[PDB]
């Protein structure tokens, strides 16, 4: 209880905002919250297209991310503006006091680029919004009349953050100054602030509210005689009339020309002493040489990678992913009819769903929250179920604590079913992003299990001041024990949930196996698509059945299994772990019996035939590998052996720039889409180089292989990822086989972070 208590206090504040360049908020629903908009102003209509909030990646943004960070302490990160002509640095600090989650610190730094010019007008603003029945907020007015000569202080107060304060310091650089008659009303050019209320439910929509008092303050100018026979400069016109107060939305609004610096300074009332921009300096430059250290700790890089360029190259991939952690809240959209047609039973059963999700039966509910990281800010800014497994493996290694409060976050979605939606689209802010035909979520619809994959790390861990937090529930064994008797219930419901929803047909049709019970199918495929699985277009049986097999699905269940003996172990769970064994052996029989292509020398998907018998479909790829990539298979088998001939095979899918997706033999080799169909997906790669290294590591005919295939394979990822970082700033979502170009979506950090991990090895 206590552990917990400390981990919540010292987790609750972030920048917790990452579909946004900069904001923060706390690990409340409805609470405070910040954000930071700037662009340039050249005319009267270019700001409007210039100014920045939410990230996005084109032309215009050379790139941005995190250089450092620690959502314990706090980070910097740079931002390469090339449309505003600017270079920014956003610097975060946490001061931990009191009892309502401590004090914080931001520093937001511009510095023109080589290309701008000299005097460019640049507005930055500083939204601030409170949500909450009985919470107050208020801007105390400037002495001056027209605005703030000097710092801007907001007072407030909520049940959740007791009493603080906000303040919006004076900063430095030049405050161009207007002639104009219109100063004589509007001042000749100062910081100003608007307090403004709206309903609580639209505060996120931080663009519009300003945008409305934009255009209220130009229509104010039109109405008052200000025209184009002599018109105020451009700056001014979109300079808000200053008129601080009472509410739950406050605009802070600067002019610069030329370079600038403003601090914002959070002070929580029950910590006492205040925070200063002295505090500001000496706290960022503190959590540097903390990151510094543990970096070295926790991700020491092994030859070849030990230079001082894939450090830089690892820190910058790490403190992206890490730095991607979001706080979410709100509504989520659900099919909960449960219509029989998802049950999928009949052939063409693609059709009948399509009919059930045309009934529109879904609806708001919630709220729910998730603290998560992300795949990517730009464009997928929030939780995804099977990629948050592979983010939380270097983020646990960091910080276990951290990794352990993720996966708690997220296993309280789960409901009474069982069931975890694949995809969290928690409230209106994050529906914003998201076309409204994919929002809606399906009880039937599941993924992979990889969070799993975390757990067996941290449970390897626990069989072998934010210094100690971060790694107390292995330091102190029954903390981790207490934490997995709780989880564990969640994790049976889980796995129970697999096999009721996500069963294989064996009995119905012309099968023989070991055992009659372990066979599994993803619901949820179309003709070109099986999304379900995460592997969205690779090829599957031809048409859809509801007679498939899937031998990935059927290795995930392997996954669950093992981990479920693991942590039933440490329990006692004596009558769970018979039970679990027994489905084991009934796996590892069955993956040979209903999945072996003895003719291929590798694992297949499976299907019923025109004829109502049992076909292999073979497409050599990510898939026919599963059993070897989850960890199901003997170090001596001989099917291991095969299965490593066509990892290292030139021909099928061994690149120069790692495994492909689908064999260059495969008949769908780079067609359609081509999204999992050719490409190298950092993940998977991640998993065999693991595996191989597993393999290379102990005693047995295939060592040497192993080892050779490990050295050359965790090389080529490497390799790869960093040189189109080292050209182009970005993670990319995979890796081009032909020309080892980054391709599909840049800013994947995202599970193309791994290449950290994979660096440090050591498995
Ligand atoms: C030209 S495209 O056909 O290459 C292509 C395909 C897709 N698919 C839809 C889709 C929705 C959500 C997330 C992902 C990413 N990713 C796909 C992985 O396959 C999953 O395993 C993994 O969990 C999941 C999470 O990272 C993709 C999307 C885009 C796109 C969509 C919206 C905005 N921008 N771009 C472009």
Redesign the pocket.
Known sequence: SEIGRLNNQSLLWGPYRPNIYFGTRPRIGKSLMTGLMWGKIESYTDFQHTVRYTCEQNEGMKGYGWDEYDPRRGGIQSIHDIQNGLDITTSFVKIPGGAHGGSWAARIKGTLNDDAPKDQKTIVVFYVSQEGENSELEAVPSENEFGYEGDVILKGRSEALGNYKLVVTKGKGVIPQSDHDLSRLRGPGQTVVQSLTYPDEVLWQAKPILFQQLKAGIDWLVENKYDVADPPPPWQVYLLANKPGSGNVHIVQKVFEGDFEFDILFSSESAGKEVTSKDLEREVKQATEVFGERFARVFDLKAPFQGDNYKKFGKSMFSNLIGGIGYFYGHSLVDRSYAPEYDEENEGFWEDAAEARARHQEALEGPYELFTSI??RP??PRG?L??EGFHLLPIADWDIDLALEIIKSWYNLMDEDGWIAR?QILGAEARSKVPKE?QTQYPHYANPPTLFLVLDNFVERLRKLDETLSTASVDNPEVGLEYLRRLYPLLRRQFDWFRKTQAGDIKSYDREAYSTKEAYRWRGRTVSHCLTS???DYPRPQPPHPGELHVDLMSWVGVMVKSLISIGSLLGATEDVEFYTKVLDAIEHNLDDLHWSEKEGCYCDATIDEFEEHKLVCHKGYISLFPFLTGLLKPDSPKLGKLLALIGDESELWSPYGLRSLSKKDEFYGTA?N??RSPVWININYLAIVQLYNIATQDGPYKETARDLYTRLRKNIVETVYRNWEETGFAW?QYNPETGKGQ??QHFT?WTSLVVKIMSGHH
């Open positions: 795949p990517s464009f997928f995804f099977w990629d995809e994919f995460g592997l969205d889409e999204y999992w979502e599909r979506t995202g």
